[PDB]
Ligand binder design. Structure first.
Ligand SMILES: [Br-]
Lengths: 333, 332, 328
């Protein structure tokens, strides 16, 4: 169980038994705080948080985890020039490494984070890159374990519905490759991940006791699901015209009550990394209902999001406990 | 009995509770001045939501937190305001799972009301369009310190300028709870909503006070123990809107002649800040050249710098009263 | 040492040589204490405001980490909206912050700003960089020079700054020689020399301490016998400054001309040495600056380069300033 002074760049750098140990430490740390017996292992330690792109949830998780454990943080938010434009990453890592005990990087390509790791001389943790999002996956795996206790991940069935090509989709293939989940990607074929990545993650997951299924057939795809998972269909970085065709393509794949009933599982739980477009009284939600008929929600309805099946807020809380585990395990012995 | 309650506006409390809160601010001010502050918020994490910037409010919350042993996460203005893309409810519930208390500053009172309904932890209004309670906490403690022998219902407070805003609304609230003799000295298009005026005037009268709205400066300021003002213009509004507000309000500039009109040599000057009193700042120079505003705008440099002016006691007191709010609501 | 309590740190010339030496010995103490896990926090209960009117990741991290190690808390007030003095007066800013904070760092625009904050704050104000002076960097550099050239007093050392010196870095070089007796050479084009009255003031003070200050376009004469070589980034308009300054690049040839194979290289950072960066590929492609700009990557990564010790020592010296001016 030695993560000490290791990096945390992507969940694939670890074995199933290590991810399990990291999750058990997070559950202990979580329980420790709930019971007011939290032992700080990071008193004296200073952490730098590089954010080349904004994410509040990920910042607050790193900040609160550090504070609970007694560390102090410097938040280095977006400043324009990405590292490697004007100044080499080599140079950034060696200056921060002299000064900080640990470095979170959230931003662009995995090549960036991997270079920062090689030169910092201190643990580097990936809060998100274009390619991998291991803190979010950790948090999802901990939530899944808490609500379906006593079952290995290869005793579980996960549905991810909607657009499986985006960065959260690839994380699902990563999750099943390492844990052996029974994974079902319920999406229109235009939004399927690259077939090569699919062939290769299925083999890894098959060898781990699970499978990966890609299908446009919702009623078949979701049978037996323990958890349904979705994310937003569109991006504020594209125009109105792009939204129209994404919504027409994907609206049939909305997680709604009828989808959940198609599972045949009365204890199915619902997951969403957030932010979620479920409330049609927001400014954007009122436009989407008026323009596209999306009353009651988009990728997930308000009824499901607010139902007892929804654990999205346990899931968000767990960002913090899992990130705390990463930092305690890589910075203290 | 502020434990786990919110701080959204002054009239969510009784006079005796506000009095209890002011005496706590005084104790925590004295404890820090004497070097014997007791950290009550150690282990607490606080989130500061700033949809609009205000360094005075940010620093007051940061230093009070830090003095009490807490840690803070400052969420500055960032893209789309809460409730545009993501539900207020969702922001509330995610923050509440991670933080022990939340400060909000930005837009409508309904935003901070929703945050408080769904966060599960105390939520403190650091300023909305409609109310600004922590500022008025500081002003009341400042007033008590500078007239320590008088009760609030023995004091006369003039607020001059434009009162159709969160400051005018909060003056009314404060008068309702303390019995102040409150004069809003302003043009008639600049008075707060009649309904709120009516409600607070009846309450002020029961606490031994009054609320008078008038365009008549000389009668308005007669007897003032304190004169209070704020800037006439918000940055980012059109040039025509600056020129119409200046034309309408410049007669209500707090200047030496207005202080003299009180007949009170002891009269003191308050201003929530920032203030436009210095015609040598870059903006001061543009307003002096364009509108003739030499000597300052809503208040003159002479008044601002004079012994009458207690604006920086008032700024410090932002921190101490905000500390009492957090201490009172986060610990028992 | 309590002679420092409640003082400002606006520029080196506000101090005596003995006082500068006191701040360095404290910096070395605090650095050795950290290395050994025996740092004693002097700043518990203290809150510090960092006014950054211009971005500087190195200066900010140094101040934050120094604060945190000593048990203080910080409020980073970075760039947002209008600068101090545009809408609100410097004085007003100083008097509000001074009521809530135990000290104020300022970084950004002119020296009159930091000086007005210090006049009115009522608490210690530290200059983290103005257009005219950059004293915390020079402290870090002085400590770095003493560490890598141990058995020598400052007035027995020869330091060269190469590049553009008509700015806060040349000005502060002048200050450091005036306070320590360095044998200081500024090796730069004639259009890149600092103001003459500062040169004159500092040249005498330096002579009273056993050193000299020399300004020359002549590189071989300028860098002869140097113990250290220092430079900084030179920067259309870009093109005016490159052609003017590229012959003053610090490369293997320039260090050879010192005749001192123990010469060390200093750079305040950030540095343009890597020609594989987005900017570095554009500068090689468009101006023929292969292998770097004001310092070649060969010098930058050589055993002669001590830039990352210099950078760490930003923190230790900023720590010493804040400990000496805040704790009685
Ligand atoms: Br902190």
């Amino acid at each position: 169980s030695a993560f000490y002074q290791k990096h945390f760049l992507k969940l694939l750098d670890f074995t199933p038994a290590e991810i399990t140990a990291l999750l058990e430490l997070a559950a202990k740390l979580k329980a420790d705080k709930k019971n007011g017996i939290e032992v700080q292992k990071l008193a004296g330690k200073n952490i730098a948080l590089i954010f080349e792109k904004d994410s509040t949830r990920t910042r607050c998780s790193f900040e609160v985890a550090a504070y609970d454990q007694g560390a102090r943080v410097t938040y280095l938010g977006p400043s324009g020039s990405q590292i490697g434009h004007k100044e080499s990453i080599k140079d950034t890592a060696r200056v921060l490494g002299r000064m900080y005990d640990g470095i979170q990087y959230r931003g662009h390509g995995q090549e960036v984070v991997e270079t920062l790791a090689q030169y910092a001389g201190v643990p580097v943790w990936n809060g998100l890159t274009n390619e991998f999002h291991p803190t979010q996956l950790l948090a999802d795996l901990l939530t899944m374990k808490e609500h379906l206790p006593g079952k290995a991940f290869n005793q579980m069935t996960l549905v991810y519905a909607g657009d499986a090509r985006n960065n959260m989709g690839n994380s699902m293939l990563e999750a099943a490759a390492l844990t052996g989940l029974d994974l079902r990607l319920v999406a229109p074929s235009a939004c399927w991940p690259e077939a090569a990545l699919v062939e290769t993650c299925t083999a890894l997951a098959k060898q781990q006791g699970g499978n990966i299924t890609l299908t446009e057939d919702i009623a078949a795809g979701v049978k037996g699901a323990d958890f349904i998972y979705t994310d937003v269909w569109v991006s504020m970085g594209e125009a109105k015209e792009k939204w129209a065709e994404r919504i027409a393509l994907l609206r049939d794949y909305q997680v709604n009550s009828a989808m959940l009933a198609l599972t045949g599982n009365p204890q199915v739980k619902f997951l969403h990394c957030l932010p979620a477009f479920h409330d049609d009284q927001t400014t954007l939600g009122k436009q989407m209902a008026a323009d596209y008929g999306l009353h009651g929600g988009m990728e997930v309805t308000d009824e499901v999001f607010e139902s007892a099946a929804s654990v999205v807020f346990d899931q968000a809380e767990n960002r913090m406990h899992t990130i705390k585990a990463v930092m305690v395990a890589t910075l203290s012995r």
